[PDB]
Amino acid sequence: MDWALFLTFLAACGAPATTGALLKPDEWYDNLNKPWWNPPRWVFPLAWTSLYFLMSLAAMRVAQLEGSGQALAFYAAQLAFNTLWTPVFFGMKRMATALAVVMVMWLFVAATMWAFFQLDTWAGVLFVPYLIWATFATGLNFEAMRLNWNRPEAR
Amino acid sequence: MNMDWALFLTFLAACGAPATTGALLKPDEWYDNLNKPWWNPPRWVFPLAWTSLYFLMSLAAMRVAQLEGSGQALAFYAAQLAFNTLWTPVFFGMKRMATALAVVMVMWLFVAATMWAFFQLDTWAGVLFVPYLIWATFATGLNFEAMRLNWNRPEA
Amino acid sequence: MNMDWALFLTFLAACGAPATTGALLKPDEWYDNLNKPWWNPPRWVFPLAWTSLYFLMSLAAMRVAQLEGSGQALAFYAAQLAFNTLWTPVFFGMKRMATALAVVMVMWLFVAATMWAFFQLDTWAGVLFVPYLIWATFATGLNFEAMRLNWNRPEA
Amino acid sequence: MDWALFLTFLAACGAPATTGALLKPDEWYDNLNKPWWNPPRWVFPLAWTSLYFLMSLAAMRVAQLEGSGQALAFYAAQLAFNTLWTPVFFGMKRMATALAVVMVMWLFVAATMWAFFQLDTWAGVLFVPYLIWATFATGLNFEAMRLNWNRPEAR
Ligand SMILES: CCCCCCCC/C=C/CCCCCCCC(=O)OC[C@H](O)CO
Ligand SMILES: CCCCCCCC/C=C/CCCCCCCC(=O)OC[C@H](O)CO
Ligand SMILES: CCCCCCCC/C=C/CCCCCCCC(=O)OC[C@H](O)CO
Ligand SMILES: CCCCCCCC/C=C/CCCCCCCC(=O)OC[C@H](O)CO
Ligand SMILES: CCCCCCCC/C=C/CCCCCCCC(=O)OC[C@H](O)CO
Ligand SMILES: CCCCCCCC/C=C/CCCCCCCC(=O)OC[C@H](O)CO
Ligand SMILES: CCCCCCCC/C=C\CCCCCCCC(=O)OC[C@H](O)CO
Ligand SMILES: CCCCCCCC/C=C\CCCCCCCC(=O)OC[C@H](O)CO
Ligand SMILES: CCCCCCCC/C=C\CCCCCCCC(=O)OC[C@H](O)CO
Ligand SMILES: CCCCCCCC/C=C\CCCCCCCC(=O)OC[C@H](O)CO
Numbered sequence A, D: 001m002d003w004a005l006f007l008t009f010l011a012a013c014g015a016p017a018t019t020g021a022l023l024k025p026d027e028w029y030d031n032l033n034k035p036w037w038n039p040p041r042w043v044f045p046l047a048w049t050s051l052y053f054l055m056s057l058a059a060m061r062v063a064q065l066e067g068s069g070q071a072l073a074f075y076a077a078q079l080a081f082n083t084l085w086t087p088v089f090f091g092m093k094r095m096a097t098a099l100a101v102v103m104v105m106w107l108f109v110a111a112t113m114w115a116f117f118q119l120d121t122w123a124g125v126l127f128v129p130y131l132i133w134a135t136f137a138t139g140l141n142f143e144a145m146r147l148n149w150n151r152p153e154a155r
Numbered sequence B, C: 001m002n003m004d005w006a007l008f009l010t011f012l013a014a015c016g017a018p019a020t021t022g023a024l025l026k027p028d029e030w031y032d033n034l035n036k037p038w039w040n041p042p043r044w045v046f047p048l049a050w051t052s053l054y055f056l057m058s059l060a061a062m063r064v065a066q067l068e069g070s071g072q073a074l075a076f077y078a079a080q081l082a083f084n085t086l087w088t089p090v091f092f093g094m095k096r097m098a099t100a101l102a103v104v105m106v107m108w109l110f111v112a113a114t115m116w117a118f119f120q121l122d123t124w125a126g127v128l129f130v131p132y133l134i135w136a137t138f139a140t141g142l143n144f145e146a147m148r149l150n151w152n153r154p155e156a
Helices: A003-012 A014-022 A027-031 A043-062 A069-091 A095-119 A121-146 B005-014 B016-023 B029-033 B045-064 B071-093 B097-121 B123-148 C005-014 C016-023 C029-033 C045-064 C071-093 C097-121 C123-148 D003-012 D014-022 D027-031 D043-062 D069-091 D095-119 D121-146
Strands: none
Touching (some): A014 B071, A043 A069, A043 B071, B016 B045, B045 B097, C016 D095, C071 D003, C097 D014, D014 D043
16 A cells, blocks of 8 residues: 555545536536436535545555556546546536547546456456446436437537 | 557547647637736647647656556656646636636646656656646746736635 | 754844734735635734744754754745745735735745755754644635635736 | 755745835835935846845855854844835835834844854855945935925834
């Protein structure tokens, strides 16, 4: 357990965490037609805070191993597109563009998890709930568009 | 040390996230009414600079990712790119100039940290980041001047 | 290592310059209309904190000034005290919040530099500066919140 | 010549240099009754910039010698009161208070110069024009008060 590595990766998640703190959910979001499986509002901040620590802990393990350059490249890509999604969806209200963002993020989270598994099982296991949540996030962006197609922001 | 296209294209794909933040910007009536300093470049200069910096920053990361002990450097690199993606929505989207100044300063320190850690592992990877740190210092100054030369309403 | 009163009284006399900046302040209608954060202390707390910090900072400098190789540390110390004297006229006098934030950040880095250089020469001199760095971090945050929670007119 | 030392001391003079840049001379200042020996406006920014480099160069020499703690203490005191004067005189228009500030500064500049002479002649020589300028500055504050006593700001 490298504390210098871990605190850097967790500080890196201060950028996506900042997007949530400055763009909390708004009536626009609560006026949208949600699917039947939409969870209560408290689920989302708890999930992201859990993932920030898990992904940071996983990256710290990988960053100590030889040949981890590709994995950390995948890790930098997923986190960037992670930071990108919330301002595109909540801030700009561009749902169709946000769907492309979250889908690219999903591919990079899946890539990071696979690359983590090739070097360390536990780092891969820690990313498994991240890929599950990303599938959830992709589904919500798709449903937000498909059940609200009558708005210009959805297309 | 090879030109690694799998590494290079991943870091370059990573720079698609901040590039989209710029691409989704409309010519703003609020931005062009702001009192800018005399050394503020025209708006078209910024996308040209960022595309060059994306490649320099991508090539530098590609070199470092092939060397042993690069974990800390790439950690600084992931943080630098994350806060880079954060600035443009905070400044242009939310119009929070004071918050955007704090973001760009966090970005600057992580750019400086990445460059220092890169120099410890590879001189050329460090050299490639020098124009990134120069532009980041320049970018911080513009956020500072934009705030003090204009009216600022209380942030949300 | 002695209690050196010639050294101690000089550093304490030096802290008379920032202390006068506080002493020459009138209860301001502009300052008390500003939207402050919930953790902003009442106005009377600040002169009490500064007087304690002046003595801690003076005693720490007095210890360092007796040791060999302290030139760099005392250089950081002179810079820290100079920018400390600068902040209060920039914030309260000129009402330049954005400029005052840059000043207090320069002060913070020189406080952090002095504490690091003090630790390299004397542990207790470094320990005495820890509450100074904590207060400086706190002071930076208030300047940041004062700016983003209020209206800011363009600076002169 | 220690470049790390010299650049720190010169950066320290960025605080008093900032007071001048943010509080340039104003019509209030040009309406005051000045003595006959008042120099043109260009003399003052040139003098202070010259003194900033000279005092920084002098302090760097002293900071390399053993037993310089007292001198650098005097140096920190003069620079603090140097930073204090311009906001009290120009900013607050408190001429009487500013006279006490500049007089305390004068005593600390004289003390720094004497302490510099005890350790290194050249550091003392570099401070000699600083003490001359401080005497000039004290005289201007006194004359500003004595030839403008009919204003509340002068008393
Ligand atoms: C929104 C779209 C939804 C699409 C539907 C979901 C698709 C899930 C596929 C995941 C890729 C699985 C990759 C994980 C394979 C890595 C395992 C591996 O080969 O590594 C060796 C072993 O782990 C050494 O420990
Ligand atoms: C290599 C990159 C891989 C990732 C790139 C992925 C790009 C996907 C873009 C989708 C834009 C929106 C198109 C899909 C819109 C479906 C929602 C919808 O239109 O709702 C259906 C209907 O309108 C309601 O009845
Ligand atoms: C409007 C302002 C526009 C201009 C903005 C001002 C630019 C200031 C930034 C300079 C960064 C240069 C950093 C150079 C330091 C790196 C050198 C180095 O440390 O090399 C290490 C060595 O090679 C192996 O350890
Ligand atoms: C509203 C906010 C109020 C609170 C503000 C947040 C406080 C953060 C500052 C911490 C400074 C502590 C610095 C401690 C580091 C010094 C320890 C050290 O380096 O010791 C060296 C060693 O003893 C010999 O080399
Ligand atoms: C506004 C008030 C105006 C008042 C009128 C002006 C008074 C000038 C007195 C200066 C003190 C002189 C102190 C300098 C003496 C230091 C010399 C010394 O003893 O050091 C030994 C020698 O220099 C080893 O090199
Ligand atoms: C240890 C500390 C040593 C330094 C402490 C020094 C304190 C000096 C204070 C002076 C305040 C003003 C008093 C002098 C005012 C003279 C100007 C004046 O009054 O003008 C004369 C007359 O009014 C016009 O005709
Ligand atoms: C603000 C904008 C300022 C920046 C504008 C820059 C424009 C591009 C200029 C020169 C290209 C230099 C590219 C350098 C390529 C280095 C990559 C490389 O050489 O790859 C190493 C590989 O291992 C082989 O051995
Ligand atoms: C915004 C538009 C740009 C973003 C759109 C998404 C772009 C992502 C596509 C490709 C990334 C690079 C893919 C190359 C990774 C393959 C490497 C790999 O999987 O194996 C590693 C090993 O080192 C091999 O030799
Ligand atoms: C924000 C406010 C927080 C700070 C509030 C502090 C209040 C004072 C508390 C304790 C006094 C500690 C004084 C420590 C004295 C150390 C000086 C000393 O011991 O001198 C060394 C000499 O060499 C002998 O050997
Ligand atoms: C704002 C109110 C406060 C400011 C008002 C001005 C205060 C300056 C007075 C005394 C400083 C300390 C004087 C003690 C210096 C004597 C030491 C000395 O000259 O000799 C050095 C040697 O180390 C000895 O043993």
